[PDB]
């Protein structure tokens, strides 16, 4: 997979986690546990003639 | 020769649904299915177990063939088995054919661990160059000119005395076979050969159900029955195929 | 942590039975509207005699 | 195969089998031996949320 | 459970048990795959004499056992080449399944 | 357990059988569809040789 692009020195992408449900109690809170789907980025380095 | 049911109206007044067809549903089926066991078990003794008694003067024998090897137990492999079936099968033909029975009209009957066992002798593995099987559902397709029917109901088929299964049915397949004399048994049996006729019923009366109200318990009660003959005839094409021992 | 205010639609309570415990208790079974009947067993040697 | 339900708790289902097939010797009493086939449920819970 | 298998008729619910030793001595990879072809047959027969519907029928499995019939089919084993298309990874019905 | 008596139109009786133990029974047997042939067998050789 190949994307052109333009103008400065680099590129980067993010990525996702992909997240795992869970049950719940009767009549309980759901604000006491839950967790992001921590997404995180990374790059490439365009070099030079 | 029947079975029967009996609805007590309390019983049925509370709960869900129906029933009452359902049951004259597993009416028909234990019958029909009884028949057949029986018929099997005729074919298997009568025509093979009687002692020096054979078909008229002219030595049509019947006469089922022995096993290579010996111990039922002996292989458990799966394969190796099924190749001694195939052999087992062609030795059928040749013992057939002394008889003259003709037109490759035949039938054959086997057990379904055993079918699997000729299943497995075949396969894409081992074996050799596809000839009679597919994968996905197998029929097999023929073999020479029997075909099996995969009855996995063999042995029983008595249904005599008592709704159990024990104690002095009527049409019996043997216990064990060594005993004084005897050949065909439970322990050490695997397929049953035939043309047709070969084997016969004659039936009488047909086959009906009736149901009938009854007093003093309150309930009422189906029973569907009926009557019919079977018995040998022509030894002279009919046989199996047992382990050695 | 938890929400108060309760309430539990289907449970016991009542005055005297505690137990401290099975908030299901009482609540009615609607079954599957289906029953499964015994497995049909269908017969050979019909034909071929 | 999945089926919806609707209301109560939990499902429940009805299953019964086969029979064993019978001699008459006449004359003989047709009701002095029944096995009766009897019945089980097969009980499923929905969980909960 | 060992016991409680439900009613009393002929339903078994059976499992399939194997040769050699488990893992340990167990696996070049082409020799579980025969050898799991066949309990593959023998768990048909075991399902088949309790009768059932013909077809109609899922086999599940792991993507390892997979991939190990796989690698069982193809060469250096099997003969007249059937149940698999070599170019591609999707196994066709084998007995009466689908996996 | 039993009824003792009945039409049974078998076990013949008569004044002069002693004991003739109870047998099925006195009606006739009928003969039925068509008889069996011994299979014919095939011409085999003289239609080469």
């Given at each position: 997979?190949?994307?052109?692009?333009?103008?400065?020195?680099?590129?980067?992408?993010?990525?996702?986690?992909?997240?795992q449900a869970?049950?719940?109690?009767?009549?309980?809170?759901?604000?006491?546990?839950?967790?992001?789907?921590?997404?995180?980025?990374?790059?490439?380095?365009?070099?030079?003639? | 020769?029947?079975?029967?049911?009996?609805?007590?109206?309390?019983?049925?007044?509370?709960?869900?649904?129906?029933?009452?067809?359902?049951?004259?549903?597993?009416?028909?089926?234990?019958?029909?299915?009884?028949?057949?066991?029986?018929?099997?078990?005729?074919?298997?003794?009568?025509?093979?177990?009687?002692?020096?008694?054979?078909?008229?003067?002219?030595?049509?024998?019947?006469?089922?063939?022995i096993?290579?090897?010996?111990?039922?137990?002996?292989?458990?492999?799966?394969?190796?088995?099924?190749?001694?079936?195939?052999?087992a099968?062609?030795?059928?033909?040749?013992?057939?054919?002394?008889?003259?029975?003709?037109?490759?009209?035949?039938?054959?009957?086997?057990?379904?661990?055993?079918?699997?066992?000729?299943?497995?002798?075949?396969?894409?593995?081992?074996?050799?160059?596809?000839?009679?099987?597919?994968?996905?559902?197998?029929?097999?397709?023929?073999?020479?000119?029997?075909?099996?029917?995969?009855?996995?109901?063999?042995?029983?088929?008595?249904?005599?005395?008592?709704?159990?299964?024990?104690?002095?049915?009527?049409?019996?397949?043997?216990?064990?076979?060594?005993?004084?004399?005897?050949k065909?048994?439970?322990?050490?049996?695997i397929?049953?050969?035939?043309?047709?006729?070969?084997?016969?019923?004659?039936?009488?009366?047909?086959?009906?159900?009736?149901?009938?109200?009854?007093?003093?318990?309150?309930?009422?009660?189906?029973?569907?029955?009926?009557?019919?003959?079977?018995?040998?005839?022509?030894?002279?094409?009919?046989?199996?195929?047992?382990?050695?021992? | 942590?938890?929400?108060?205010?309760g309430?539990?639609?289907?449970?016991?309570?009542?005055?005297?039975?505690?137990?401290?415990?099975?908030?299901?208790?009482?609540?009615?079974?609607?079954?599957?509207?289906?029953?499964?009947?015994?497995?049909?067993?269908?017969?050979?040697?019909?034909?071929?005699?």
């Amino acid at each position: 997979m190949v994307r052109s692009i333009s103008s400065g020195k680099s590129a980067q992408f993010p990525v996702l986690g992909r997240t795992q449900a869970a049950y719940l109690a009767p009549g309980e809170n759901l604000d006491d546990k839950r967790k992001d789907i921590k997404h995180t980025e990374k790059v490439i380095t365009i070099d030079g003639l | 020769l029947t079975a029967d049911v009996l609805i007590y109206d309390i019983e049925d007044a509370m709960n869900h649904y129906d029933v009452r067809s359902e049951y004259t549903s597993q009416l028909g089926e234990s019958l029909a299915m009884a028949a057949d066991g029986a018929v099997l078990a005729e074919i298997a003794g009568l025509c093979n177990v009687e002692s020096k008694y054979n078909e008229n003067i002219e030595g049509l024998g019947t006469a089922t063939v022995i096993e290579t090897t010996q111990n039922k137990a002996a292989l458990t492999d799966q394969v190796a088995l099924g190749k001694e079936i195939i052999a087992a099968l062609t030795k059928a033909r040749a013992a057939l054919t002394k008889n003259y029975v003709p037109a490759a009209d035949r039938v054959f009957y086997c057990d379904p661990d055993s079918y699997s066992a000729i299943l497995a002798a075949l396969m894409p593995n081992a074996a050799n160059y596809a000839a009679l099987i597919d994968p996905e559902k197998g029929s097999i397709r023929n073999v020479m000119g029997f075909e099996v029917v995969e009855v996995p109901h063999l042995t029983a088929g008595g249904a005599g005395t008592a709704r159990e299964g024990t104690t002095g049915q009527k049409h019996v397949f043997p216990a064990n076979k060594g005993e004084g004399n005897v050949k065909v048994a439970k322990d050490n049996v695997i397929g049953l050969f035939m043309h047709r006729s070969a084997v016969g019923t004659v039936k009488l009366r047909d086959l009906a159900l009736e149901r009938a109200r009854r007093a003093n318990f309150q309930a009422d009660q189906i029973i569907a029955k009926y009557a019919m003959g079977h018995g040998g005839l022509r030894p002279e094409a009919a046989g199996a195929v047992v382990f050695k021992v | 942590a938890s929400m108060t205010g309760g309430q539990q639609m289907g449970t016991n309570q009542g005055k005297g039975v505690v137990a401290a415990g099975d908030k299901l208790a009482l609540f009615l079974k609607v079954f599957g509207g289906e029953v499964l009947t015994a497995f049909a067993r269908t017969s050979v040697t019909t034909s071929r005699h």
